[PDB]
Protein backbone atom coordinates (compact mmCIF):
# COMPACT_ATOMS: atom_id res chain seq x y z
CA UNK A 1 0.00 0.00 0.00
CA UNK A 2 3.03 2.30 0.20
CA UNK A 3 4.57 3.90 -2.87
CA UNK A 4 7.20 6.46 -3.76
CA UNK A 5 7.56 8.13 -7.15
CA UNK A 6 10.77 10.07 -7.65
CA UNK A 7 10.74 12.65 -10.47
CA UNK A 8 13.63 14.74 -9.14
CA UNK A 9 15.99 11.84 -9.70
CA UNK A 10 16.18 12.27 -13.50
CA UNK A 11 19.18 14.07 -15.00
CA UNK A 12 16.65 16.17 -16.93
CA UNK A 13 15.29 17.40 -13.55
CA UNK A 14 18.79 17.73 -12.04
CA UNK A 15 19.89 19.86 -15.00
CA UNK A 16 16.97 22.24 -14.47
CA UNK A 17 17.72 22.49 -10.75
CA UNK A 18 21.41 23.29 -11.44
CA UNK A 19 20.55 25.72 -14.22
CA UNK A 20 18.39 27.69 -11.76
CA UNK A 21 21.16 27.80 -9.14
CA UNK A 22 23.61 28.97 -11.81
CA UNK A 23 21.22 31.68 -13.00
CA UNK A 24 20.77 32.88 -9.41
CA UNK A 25 24.50 32.98 -8.68
CA UNK A 26 25.37 34.67 -11.98
CA UNK A 27 22.61 37.32 -11.96
CA UNK A 28 23.55 40.96 -11.37
CA UNK A 29 21.63 40.71 -8.09
CA UNK A 30 22.38 37.24 -6.76
CA UNK A 31 19.85 34.76 -5.43
CA UNK A 32 19.41 31.09 -4.57
CA UNK A 33 16.21 29.04 -4.98
CA UNK A 34 14.32 28.47 -1.65
CA UNK A 35 13.97 24.75 -2.35
CA UNK A 36 17.69 24.33 -1.59
CA UNK A 37 17.04 25.03 2.08
CA UNK A 38 15.54 21.59 2.33
CA UNK A 39 18.04 18.78 2.62
CA UNK A 40 17.79 16.62 5.77
CA UNK A 41 19.55 19.26 7.88
CA UNK A 42 17.33 22.07 6.58
CA UNK A 43 14.09 20.11 6.93
CA UNK A 44 14.90 19.71 10.62
CA UNK A 45 15.90 23.38 11.01
CA UNK A 46 12.52 24.42 9.62
CA UNK A 47 10.93 22.05 12.11
CA UNK A 48 12.81 23.90 14.86
CA UNK A 49 11.58 27.22 13.46
CA UNK A 50 7.93 26.13 13.78
CA UNK A 51 8.39 26.05 17.56
CA UNK A 52 10.03 29.49 18.04
CA UNK A 53 8.05 32.04 20.07
CA UNK A 54 8.52 34.60 17.27
CA UNK A 55 7.30 32.28 14.51
CA UNK A 56 3.53 32.62 14.90
CA UNK A 57 2.46 31.06 11.53
CA UNK A 58 2.63 27.36 12.42
CA UNK A 59 0.68 27.49 15.71
CA UNK A 60 -1.80 30.02 14.32
CA UNK A 61 -2.59 27.77 11.36
CA UNK A 62 -2.67 24.69 13.57
CA UNK A 63 -5.30 26.34 15.77
CA UNK A 64 -7.48 27.13 12.76
CA UNK A 65 -7.02 23.51 11.62
CA UNK A 66 -7.82 22.11 15.08
CA UNK A 67 -11.09 23.98 15.23
CA UNK A 68 -12.10 23.92 11.59
CA UNK A 69 -10.95 20.56 10.18
CA UNK A 70 -14.48 19.06 10.33
CA UNK A 71 -15.82 22.07 8.42
CA UNK A 72 -13.03 21.81 5.83
CA UNK A 73 -13.60 18.10 5.27
CA UNK A 74 -17.39 18.52 5.06
CA UNK A 75 -17.00 21.16 2.37
CA UNK A 76 -14.38 19.20 0.44
CA UNK A 77 -15.90 15.72 0.75
CA UNK A 78 -12.61 14.32 -0.46
CA UNK A 79 -11.41 10.72 -0.05
CA UNK A 80 -7.88 11.65 -1.06
CA UNK A 81 -5.63 14.17 0.64
CA UNK A 82 -2.81 15.67 -1.42
CA UNK A 83 -0.23 17.75 0.43
CA UNK A 84 2.19 20.02 -1.36
CA UNK A 85 5.45 20.85 0.38
CA UNK A 86 4.30 18.31 2.93
CA UNK A 87 7.41 18.19 5.11
CA UNK A 88 6.65 16.24 8.26
CA UNK A 89 2.87 16.61 7.73
CA UNK A 90 2.24 17.30 11.43
CA UNK A 91 -0.67 19.74 10.91
CA UNK A 92 -1.93 17.39 8.22
CA UNK A 93 -2.79 14.75 10.80
CA UNK A 94 -5.70 16.99 11.83
CA UNK A 95 -7.05 16.85 8.28
CA UNK A 96 -6.37 13.09 8.04
CA UNK A 97 -8.22 12.54 11.34
CA UNK A 98 -11.21 14.51 10.15
CA UNK A 99 -11.34 12.56 6.86
CA UNK A 100 -11.01 9.30 8.74
CA UNK A 101 -13.77 10.44 11.13
CA UNK A 102 -16.05 11.24 8.19
CA UNK A 103 -15.28 7.72 6.96
CA UNK A 104 -13.88 9.04 3.63
CA UNK A 105 -10.13 8.59 3.98
CA UNK A 106 -8.69 6.21 1.36
CA UNK A 107 -5.44 7.79 0.23
CA UNK A 108 -2.67 10.26 1.25
CA UNK A 109 -0.36 11.83 -1.32
CA UNK A 110 2.52 13.78 0.27
CA UNK A 111 4.53 15.75 -2.26
CA UNK A 112 7.98 17.16 -1.41
CA UNK A 113 11.39 18.02 -2.85
CA UNK A 114 12.99 16.12 0.04
CA UNK A 115 12.65 12.34 -0.29
CA UNK A 116 13.91 11.78 3.24
CA UNK A 117 11.07 13.77 4.76
CA UNK A 118 8.74 11.79 2.47
CA UNK A 119 9.99 8.40 3.63
CA UNK A 120 9.72 9.39 7.29
CA UNK A 121 6.30 11.04 7.20
CA UNK A 122 5.09 8.38 4.75
CA UNK A 123 6.00 5.43 6.94
CA UNK A 124 4.55 7.25 9.99
CA UNK A 125 1.22 8.06 8.37
CA UNK A 126 1.09 4.57 6.84
CA UNK A 127 1.19 3.12 10.35
CA UNK A 128 -1.05 5.73 12.08
CA UNK A 129 -3.82 5.09 9.55
CA UNK A 130 -3.74 1.36 8.69
CA UNK A 131 -5.38 0.45 5.40
CA UNK A 132 -4.69 3.85 3.83
CA UNK A 133 -2.68 3.82 0.60
CA UNK A 134 0.25 6.22 0.56
CA UNK A 135 1.54 7.63 -2.74
CA UNK A 136 4.57 9.75 -1.95
CA UNK A 137 5.80 11.96 -4.76
CA UNK A 138 9.27 13.42 -4.80
CA UNK A 139 9.21 16.41 -7.10
CA UNK A 140 9.22 20.18 -7.57
CA UNK A 141 5.74 21.68 -7.11
CA UNK A 142 6.57 24.25 -9.80
CA UNK A 143 7.29 21.53 -12.34
CA UNK A 144 5.81 18.14 -11.44
CA UNK A 145 2.18 18.69 -10.36
CA UNK A 146 0.94 16.76 -13.43
CA UNK A 147 2.46 13.64 -11.87
CA UNK A 148 0.08 13.70 -8.91
CA UNK A 149 -2.48 10.90 -9.43
CA UNK A 150 -6.00 11.96 -10.50
CA UNK A 151 -7.68 9.13 -8.57
CA UNK A 152 -10.75 9.76 -6.39
CA UNK A 153 -12.05 13.07 -5.10
CA UNK A 154 -9.04 15.10 -4.03
CA UNK A 155 -8.35 17.74 -1.43
CA UNK A 156 -5.07 19.40 -2.32
CA UNK A 157 -3.55 21.29 0.59
CA UNK A 158 -0.73 23.83 0.53
CA UNK A 159 -0.24 24.92 4.12
CA UNK A 160 2.17 27.14 6.01
CA UNK A 161 2.06 30.05 3.56
CA UNK A 162 4.62 28.25 1.39
CA UNK A 163 2.74 29.84 -1.53
CA UNK A 164 4.33 33.11 -0.36
CA UNK A 165 7.81 31.77 -1.08
CA UNK A 166 7.00 32.34 -4.77
CA UNK A 167 7.22 35.84 -6.26
CA UNK A 168 4.09 37.11 -8.05
CA UNK A 169 4.94 35.96 -11.59
CA UNK A 170 5.85 32.37 -10.77
CA UNK A 171 3.12 32.35 -8.08
CA UNK A 172 0.51 33.06 -10.73
CA UNK A 173 1.95 30.36 -13.05
CA UNK A 174 1.94 27.87 -10.16
CA UNK A 175 -1.67 28.58 -9.18
CA UNK A 176 -2.85 28.44 -12.80
CA UNK A 177 -1.05 25.12 -13.24
CA UNK A 178 -2.41 23.75 -9.96
CA UNK A 179 -5.90 24.81 -11.01
CA UNK A 180 -5.47 22.99 -14.29
CA UNK A 181 -4.55 19.75 -12.51
CA UNK A 182 -7.83 19.82 -10.53
CA UNK A 183 -10.78 17.81 -11.72
CA UNK A 184 -14.49 18.52 -11.10
CA UNK A 185 -15.10 17.87 -7.44
CA UNK A 186 -11.48 18.59 -6.38
CA UNK A 187 -10.56 21.33 -3.87
CA UNK A 188 -7.58 23.42 -2.91
CA UNK A 189 -6.92 24.32 0.74
CA UNK A 190 -4.43 27.20 0.79
CA UNK A 191 -2.74 28.75 3.84
CA UNK A 192 -1.79 32.44 3.53
CA UNK A 193 -0.01 34.50 6.19
CA UNK A 194 -1.57 37.94 6.28
CA UNK A 195 -0.22 41.48 6.35
CA UNK A 196 0.18 42.60 9.96
CA UNK A 197 2.51 44.68 12.15
CA UNK A 198 5.99 44.54 10.62
CA UNK A 199 7.82 44.30 13.93
CA UNK A 200 6.00 40.97 14.31
CA UNK A 201 6.70 39.98 10.68
CA UNK A 202 10.44 40.79 10.83
CA UNK A 203 10.95 39.17 14.25
CA UNK A 204 9.44 35.90 12.98
CA UNK A 205 12.34 35.67 10.51
CA UNK A 206 15.00 37.02 12.84
CA UNK A 207 14.61 35.11 16.11
CA UNK A 208 16.88 35.78 19.07
CA UNK A 209 17.95 32.12 19.19
CA UNK A 210 19.62 32.36 15.76
CA UNK A 211 17.61 29.48 14.36
CA UNK A 212 16.32 31.25 11.25
CA UNK A 213 19.89 32.48 10.71
CA UNK A 214 21.22 28.91 10.76
CA UNK A 215 18.39 27.82 8.47
CA UNK A 216 19.27 30.63 6.05
CA UNK A 217 23.03 29.89 6.10
CA UNK A 218 22.46 26.16 5.66
CA UNK A 219 21.54 26.79 2.01
CA UNK A 220 25.31 27.35 1.58
CA UNK A 221 26.03 24.01 3.31
CA UNK A 222 23.68 22.24 0.92
CA UNK A 223 25.22 23.87 -2.13
CA UNK A 224 28.66 23.11 -0.64
CA UNK A 225 27.94 19.44 -0.15
CA UNK A 226 25.87 18.76 -3.24
CA UNK A 227 27.47 20.96 -5.91
CA UNK A 228 31.06 20.89 -4.60
CA UNK A 229 31.11 24.54 -3.55
CA UNK A 230 33.31 26.21 -0.95
CA UNK A 231 31.17 28.95 0.64
CA UNK A 232 32.59 30.07 3.99
CA UNK A 233 29.44 30.12 6.14
CA UNK A 234 31.16 32.36 8.69
CA UNK A 235 31.63 35.01 6.01
CA UNK A 236 27.89 35.60 5.51
CA UNK A 237 25.36 37.13 7.89
CA UNK A 238 21.65 36.53 8.03
CA UNK A 239 19.52 39.58 7.14
CA UNK A 240 15.71 39.78 7.34
CA UNK A 241 13.89 42.77 5.84
CA UNK A 242 10.38 44.01 5.17
CA UNK A 243 9.87 45.06 1.56
CA UNK A 244 6.86 47.37 1.94
CA UNK A 245 6.49 47.91 -1.82
CA UNK A 246 6.10 44.18 -2.45
CA UNK A 247 4.63 43.54 1.02
CA UNK A 248 6.99 40.66 1.68
CA UNK A 249 9.65 39.57 4.12
CA UNK A 250 13.01 38.95 2.44
CA UNK A 251 15.80 36.80 3.80
CA UNK A 252 19.24 37.80 2.59
CA UNK A 253 22.77 36.60 3.17
CA UNK A 254 25.32 39.41 3.20
CA UNK A 255 29.08 39.06 2.69
CA UNK A 256 31.09 40.55 5.56
CA UNK A 257 34.17 40.83 3.33
CA UNK A 258 35.02 40.04 -0.29
CA UNK A 259 34.38 36.39 -1.00
CA UNK A 260 35.47 34.24 -3.87
CA UNK A 261 33.46 31.04 -4.28
CA UNK A 262 33.71 28.14 -6.72
CA UNK A 263 30.78 25.80 -7.39
CA UNK A 264 32.64 22.96 -9.07
CA UNK A 265 29.65 20.86 -10.20
CA UNK A 266 28.42 23.93 -12.07
CA UNK A 267 31.83 24.77 -13.62
CA UNK A 268 31.30 28.11 -11.93
CA UNK A 269 33.26 30.65 -9.92
CA UNK A 270 31.47 33.69 -8.47
CA UNK A 271 32.55 36.63 -6.34
CA UNK A 272 30.86 38.73 -3.68
CA UNK A 273 31.82 42.31 -2.78
CA UNK A 274 32.04 43.42 0.86
CA UNK A 275 28.48 44.14 1.96
CA UNK A 276 26.98 42.54 -1.15
CA UNK A 277 23.68 40.76 -0.47
CA UNK A 278 22.17 37.58 -1.91
CA UNK A 279 18.41 36.97 -1.81
CA UNK A 280 17.72 33.49 -0.39
CA UNK A 281 13.98 33.59 0.27
CA UNK A 282 10.91 35.79 -0.11
CA UNK A 283 7.87 35.40 2.13
CA UNK A 284 4.95 37.32 0.61
CA UNK A 285 2.27 38.50 3.07
CA UNK A 286 -1.27 38.74 1.72
CA UNK A 287 -4.38 40.90 2.06
CA UNK A 288 -7.64 38.91 2.22
CA UNK A 289 -9.16 40.43 -0.94
CA UNK A 290 -5.97 39.88 -2.97
CA UNK A 291 -6.05 36.21 -2.09
CA UNK A 292 -9.55 36.05 -3.58
CA UNK A 293 -8.36 37.87 -6.73
CA UNK A 294 -5.21 35.76 -7.15
CA UNK A 295 -7.27 32.58 -6.94
CA UNK A 296 -9.74 34.01 -9.47
CA UNK A 297 -6.97 34.97 -11.92
CA UNK A 298 -5.69 31.38 -11.74
CA UNK A 299 -9.16 30.02 -12.51
CA UNK A 300 -10.12 29.16 -8.93
CA UNK A 301 -13.08 30.37 -6.88
CA UNK A 302 -12.70 30.81 -3.12
CA UNK A 303 -15.70 29.08 -1.52
CA UNK A 304 -14.56 29.21 2.11
CA UNK A 305 -12.36 31.49 4.20
CA UNK A 306 -11.24 30.76 7.78
CA UNK A 307 -9.14 33.00 10.03
CA UNK A 308 -7.94 33.14 13.63
CA UNK A 309 -9.54 35.77 15.92
CA UNK A 310 -6.75 38.32 15.43
CA UNK A 311 -6.73 37.80 11.67
CA UNK A 312 -3.02 36.79 11.65
CA UNK A 313 -3.48 33.98 9.11
CA UNK A 314 -6.08 32.78 6.62
CA UNK A 315 -7.10 29.45 5.16
CA UNK A 316 -8.94 29.34 1.80
CA UNK A 317 -10.94 26.56 0.25
CA UNK A 318 -11.23 26.95 -3.53
CA UNK A 319 -12.73 25.05 -6.46
CA UNK A 320 -12.26 25.26 -10.25
CA UNK A 321 -14.18 28.06 -11.93
Ligand SMILES: Nc1ncnc2c1ncn2[C@@H]1O[C@H](CSCC[C@H](N)C(=O)O)[C@@H](O)[C@H]1O
Nearest residue numbers: 035038085086087112113139140141159160
Ligand atom coordinates in the same frame (compact mmCIF):
# COMPACT_ATOMS: atom_id res chain seq x y z
N1 LIG B 1 9.79 23.61 -5.03
C1 LIG B 1 9.37 22.72 -4.13
N2 LIG B 1 8.75 21.56 -4.54
C2 LIG B 1 8.33 20.62 -3.62
N3 LIG B 1 8.54 20.86 -2.28
C3 LIG B 1 9.15 22.00 -1.87
C4 LIG B 1 9.58 22.95 -2.78
N4 LIG B 1 10.15 23.97 -2.09
C5 LIG B 1 10.08 23.68 -0.77
N5 LIG B 1 9.48 22.45 -0.61
C6 LIG B 1 9.13 21.73 0.64
O1 LIG B 1 8.00 22.41 1.16
C7 LIG B 1 8.02 22.51 2.58
C8 LIG B 1 8.00 23.99 2.98
S1 LIG B 1 8.16 24.30 4.77
C9 LIG B 1 6.47 23.69 5.06
C10 LIG B 1 6.40 22.36 5.79
C11 LIG B 1 4.97 22.01 6.21
N6 LIG B 1 4.11 21.88 5.04
C12 LIG B 1 4.42 23.11 7.10
O2 LIG B 1 3.45 23.79 6.73
O3 LIG B 1 4.93 23.35 8.20
C13 LIG B 1 9.29 21.81 3.02
O4 LIG B 1 8.97 20.50 3.41
C14 LIG B 1 10.16 21.77 1.76
O5 LIG B 1 10.98 20.64 1.76
Ligand SMILES: N[C@@H](Cc1c[nH]c[nH+]1)C(=O)O
Nearest residue numbers: 049160161162165205283
Ligand atom coordinates in the same frame (compact mmCIF):
# COMPACT_ATOMS: atom_id res chain seq x y z
N1 LIG C 1 7.51 28.67 4.27
C1 LIG C 1 8.15 29.33 5.40
C2 LIG C 1 9.67 29.13 5.35
C3 LIG C 1 10.43 29.88 6.40
C4 LIG C 1 10.22 30.01 7.73
N2 LIG C 1 11.22 30.82 8.22
C5 LIG C 1 12.02 31.16 7.22
N3 LIG C 1 11.56 30.62 6.11
C6 LIG C 1 7.80 30.82 5.43
O1 LIG C 1 7.77 31.47 4.39
O2 LIG C 1 7.53 31.39 6.49
